[PDB]
Enzyme design. Structure first.
Site, PDB file in Angstrom:
ATOM      1  CD  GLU A 256      43.956  44.043  20.054  1.00 14.57           C
ATOM      2  OE1 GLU A 256      43.286  42.904  20.178  1.00 14.57           O
ATOM      3  OE2 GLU A 256      42.940  45.265  19.927  1.00 14.57           O
ATOM      4  CD  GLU A 332      46.228  44.309  14.621  1.00 13.72           C
ATOM      5  OE1 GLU A 332      44.826  44.593  14.885  1.00 13.72           O
ATOM      6  OE2 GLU A 332      46.497  43.991  15.942  1.00 13.72           O
ATOM      7  CB  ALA A 334      43.872  48.562   4.848  1.00  7.75           C
ATOM      8  CG  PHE A 396      35.704  39.848  14.719  1.00  9.86           C
ATOM      9  CD1 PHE A 396      35.100  40.817  13.710  1.00  9.86           C
ATOM     10  CD2 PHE A 396      37.000  39.961  15.399  1.00  9.86           C
ATOM     11  CE1 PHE A 396      35.919  41.936  13.238  1.00  9.86           C
ATOM     12  CE2 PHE A 396      37.672  41.239  14.779  1.00  9.86           C
ATOM     13  CZ  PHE A 396      37.122  42.369  13.832  1.00  9.86           C
TER      14      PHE A 396
HETATM   15 NA    NA Z   1      39.331  39.415  13.595  1.00 11.72          NA
END
Ligand code: NA
Ligand code: NA
Ligand code: NA
Ligand code: NA
EC number: 3.2.1.23
Lengths: 409, 204
Positions: A256, A332, A334, A396
């Protein structure tokens, strides 16, 4: 923050082995291999020095080669007087895979012609070829089906400090649950993890420690020449350290961080330096010029997510976009956050049906919860905001297939 | 525009088309069609024929057309729909999602076919959605896929009109006849009626 991995003292000779690279090349049916080991020295060169590289299968030496320093001529100014390359023929080698992690031992000796050892270095060697051909990721000539998971270095009591016991526990549970690969999300791991993956048998995606998700746009730094130097070290030093591990099958440029020209330069640097492993990177749309594998995050099976610039196509459709030929393995997929994994079978069915869909890495292994204690001394699982940290992103951080203590969800 | 070459009843299907002694005869079927129809703008693609397996004759003729008329792609479905004699993957009755893995000449799901290793051509079904009788069930599934996948560029439904023939009853009234109704035998009965419209053009 802090000193979270080991600290050691290493005493080497002044005349020493300063680097060594082991490569394994094969014939058409893997019945013959050449092991090539480039060895570099630091110190005073002397005519009597030699390097011997020996290959062992258990207590049996299967091959060896010895030579004085002095590389082949490489340009108008000569060669590397401080390097040598040894080439060992190996017949019917036992091949390495996550299914049968066959390993040999390579011992690199810096010594004198007359027999005195100056010092020795060594590594476990797995004879395996990784290549992409005709749109398929092949291991020893056969196409892989990646049953992978992303794994962060996390312990509910120790934070980011990893220990052998926990690493072993994780590998055992992964294997027990039919995983065959792991992605070092998102940085190089503690050294021991590689040695265990080589020995227990897991395919590894080694990822450089570069993530700039919070910039706007995401490639603000990675497209800037001024940050090429800091970035470069994150990739080059990882390769220098991990290149001889057989478990490492693919290198990743980080995570990212959008798609910047810095990525392209580093992608090419790896391809030049280590042609033995594909290079992947998901930033900027998952199919940029900086990746050998289309490697999206969270692309769906049948449903398109046509976001501007960086769409996430249905994986089945992505494969066949005009002019696309690469393999697709999700970096990445699921998202295992809380009560989740709905739709998991949809992925598997696709992976089995489409040769070019070669699997993916579930996100993710373990919940990043931390232990806290109540008035009574009784522990409980804490998440973001529980330490007075703010701003914070609450739960998160818990997206695992297992709770922090390794109990399964 | 398709050459008048079909040798479906041979065993194996390419018995004649792989036979050089049949090259001349086949060659006239392709060359004379091209010489007659090459100036029509409506013709966009040439076809080597239908259901005659895949033989060397096909490869020779495919090259002949590419050479004389570079303006149109050449397609041919025999031998598996994706042979060296076709610029377009052009299967007949391949399904949307389901594979039909027949030996030698499988019919992959169209979505999967586009992405097999090394494959890069467009895919347009030469025949699909067999409209025999009360049919066309699942038509929408094809359309949804054609619209989602760039390289799935459509297809040709099988087929336009029923091949029924008119016969007259004892009292002279007309009725729709099919295979076997003329004393023909052996015959394939109603298989000759697969259209979207009745023989008189009334729509089904
Ligand atoms: Na996370
Ligand atoms: Na697959
Ligand atoms: Na389309
Ligand atoms: Na028919």
């Amino acid at each position: 923050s802090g000193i979270f991995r080991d600290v050691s003292l290493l005493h080497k000779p002044t005349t020493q082995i300063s680097d060594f690279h082991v490569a394994t090349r094969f014939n058409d049916d893997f019945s013959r291999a050449v092991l090539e080991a480039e060895v570099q020295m630091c110190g005073e060169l002397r005519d009597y020095l030699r390097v011997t590289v020996s290959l062992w299968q258990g207590e049996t030496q299967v091959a060896s080669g010895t030579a004085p320093f002095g590389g082949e001529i490489i340009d108008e100014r000569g060669g590397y007087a401080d390097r040598v390359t040894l080439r060992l023929n190996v017949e019917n080698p036992k091949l390495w895979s996550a299914e049968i992690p066959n390993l040999y031992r390579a011992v690199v000796e810096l010594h004198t012609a007359d027999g005195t050892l100056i010092e020795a270095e060594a590594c476990d060697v797995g004879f395996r070829e990784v290549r992409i051909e005709n749109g398929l990721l092949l291991l020893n000539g056969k196409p892989l089906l990646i049953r992978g998971v992303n794994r962060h270095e996390h312990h509910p009591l120790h934070g980011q400090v990893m220990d052998e016991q926990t690493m072993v526990q994780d590998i055992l549970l992964m294997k027990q649950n039919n995983f065959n690969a792991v992605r070092c999300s998102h940085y190089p791991n503690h050294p021991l993890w590689y040695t265990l993956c080589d020995r227990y048998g897991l395919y590894v995606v080694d990822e450089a420690n570069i993530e700039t998700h919070g910039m706007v746009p995401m490639n603000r730094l990675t497209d800037d020449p001024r940050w090429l130097p800091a970035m470069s070290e994150r990739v080059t030093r990882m390769v220098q350290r991990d290149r001889n591990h057989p478990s490492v099958i693919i290198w990743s440029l980080g995570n990212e961080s959008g798609h910047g020209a810095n990525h392209d330069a580093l992608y090419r640097w790896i391809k030049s330096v280590d042609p033995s492993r594909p290079v992947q990177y998901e930033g900027g749309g998952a199919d940029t010029t900086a990746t050998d594998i289309i490697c999206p995050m969270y692309a769906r099976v049948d449903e398109d997510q046509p976001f501007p610039a960086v769409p996430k196509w249905s994986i089945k459709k992505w494969l066949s976009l005009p002019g696309e030929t690469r393999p697709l393995i999700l970096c990445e997929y699921a998202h295992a956050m809380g009560n989740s994994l709905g739709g998991f079978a949809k992925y598997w069915q696709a992976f089995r049906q489409y040769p070019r869909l070669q699997g993916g890495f579930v996100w993710d292994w373990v919940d990043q919860s931390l232990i806290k204690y109540d008035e009574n001394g009784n522990p409980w699982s804490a998440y973001g905001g529980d330490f007075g940290d703010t701003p914070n992103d609450r739960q998160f951080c818990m997206n695992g297939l297992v709770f922090a203590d390794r109990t399964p969800h």
